[PDB]
Symmetry: C2
Subunit: 172 residues, 2 copies
């Protein structure tokens, strides 16, 4: 169940708007939060994300995610944020500068090289140089808003970088 969530380590979400509902429960593992969220059983809202507090072993289920207005992500070493992929926009606007989905394959079908790997391809596209642009895992990204949309360094030594094949929101 936990794999149709995008995981952001060491992160929680704080609501500013107090009208947005939350539900919390002391639980055993993050897996149990995800199961509850996906099947949405005893939650008075549509679960869009949850946070697992590893130290208190508590689930926090939310009808919002990090891209919702009224909320802020925050560092916290004991938290992991899990966002339901159905609520992370899976199509691109403009050149895809704001794309935060989890596609990690190029247009010709090659798996992306993680941004924090220098192999096979060395580059200066590391997390800290483009803070706010989610150069996490090996996700297709467009940090500088370049022509062909989100792209990545390729796990193929033969191919430095290639664009991915994330549809324009205007495609269909």
């Amino acid at each position: 169940t936990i794999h149709e969530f995008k995981k952001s380590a060491k992160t929680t979400l704080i609501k500013i708007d107090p009208a947005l509902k939350i539900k919390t429960k002391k639980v055993n593992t993050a897996d149990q939060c995800a199961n509850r969220c996906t099947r949405n059983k005893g939650l008075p809202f549509t679960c869009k994300a949850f946070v697992f507090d590893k130290a208190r072993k508590q689930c926090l289920w939310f009808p919002f995610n990090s891209m919702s207005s009224g909320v802020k992500k925050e560092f916290g070493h004991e938290f992991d944020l899990y966002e339901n992929k159905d609520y992370i926009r899976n199509c691109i606007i403009g050149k895809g500068r704001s794309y935060k989905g989890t596609v990690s394959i190029t247009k010709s079908g090659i798996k992306c090289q993680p941004w924090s790997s220098m192999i096979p391809h060395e580059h200066s596209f590391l997390p800290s140089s483009y803070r706010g642009k989610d150069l996490q895992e090996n996700y297709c990204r467009n940090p500088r808003g370049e022509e062909g949309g989100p792209w990545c360094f390729t796990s193929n030594p033969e191919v430095r970088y290639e664009v991915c094949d994330i549809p324009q929101c205007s495609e269909v």
Copy 2:
């Protein structure tokens, strides 16, 4: 690692490419799960896998760099086929009133599981699929078949709540 439950399934359906230029990959297999895993992993495919079909009679996976909504491709009926579309390539946000919404959200704004369109339980209704062709009134997905101002909705599995809008974000509203 059975990834099959993560696709949107359309029974009795395969895809045929009008455009001859588009590229498939096929393989003889035992079960539909094996097609799913290879699509999810995108292992050994010279393209991005947006959908696959399992042929239950010929025991074959067909992997596509397109889905049922791509130009140059059309559905075809067949008892032996099931189509599985990768959710990462089915637009998960709404444009306008969401008349063309094809995503798989099936819970209302207040968290109620939607009633299947094909069922009259708890709620009797005339939003039958056959009455709304092209509006994809399948399973219990939130839909807006008449294009009304509130966005996609569904009849509800709560006997006290006949229908409710679902909470699906607009693709772009600045």
